């Protein structure tokens, strides 16, 4: 038997993922001291 409709469940998460503090950053780091920032617990937009 075939499925009837598709359901997608994502959480609410009332914040956009802050890629603006890692992409639009005035001081990018160096390669011996590369800045690592974990981004989590949000809804991300990869279309931009």
């Amino acid at each position, epitope marked *: 038997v075939q499925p009837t409709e598709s359901i997608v469940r994502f959480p609410n998460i009332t914040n956009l993922c*802050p890629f*603006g*503090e890692v992409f*639009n*950053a*005035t*001081r990018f780091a160096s390669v011996y001291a590369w800045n690592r920032k974990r981004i989590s617990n949000c809804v991300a937009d990869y279309s931009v």
Partner: antibody
Amino acid sequence: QVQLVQSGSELKKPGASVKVSCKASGYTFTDYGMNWVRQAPGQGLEWMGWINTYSGEPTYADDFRGRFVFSLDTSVSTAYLQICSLKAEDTAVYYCARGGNWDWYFDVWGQGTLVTVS
Amino acid sequence: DIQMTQSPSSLSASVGDRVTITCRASQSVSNFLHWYQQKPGKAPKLLIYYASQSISGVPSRFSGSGSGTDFTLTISSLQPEDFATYYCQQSNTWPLTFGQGTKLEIK
């Protein structure tokens, strides 16, 4: 002696196109960039973008992506900005700023271009 | 996009006292928050760069401190002739936004 002299107080129609000047002297002009901020008298400083000394690409800010145009004329030490299609909400001064690519603090120096529109 | 607020809006102080003004951040400006002041009818001048260091050639009656999202400078010896509107400036994320200002006033 390092200083950044400016143009005078401009007064034009809402829709004219005026070009303000920022003449530099004293330092290595190709070394540090030519940042520009705006300040309404009831508000604070707002950065509008900059332009590199060697290529001339006018990279604006995230808000003022439109009618602001930076114009470069090298080997005479000028940092010309031009505003076109002026609006009545742009009653603000336009401060020029020598500002480097790495340190990114200003030491902004402009005597005040009183761009009054009515 | 980065909302840079600072409190109190209008606080008064007297001659020779010690005052503390803050600058509260919404997002992370972890080290890059600079300090300016603006006299009326005057192009501004640096006070504290990189939130701890002081520029050479300023009167050192004040020092800046703080990290994270809370930043301050403390005027250890206040003088009446300033009447300056203190300005915040972050150097971390584009666009470079500023603060509204803490106007210092005499009683």
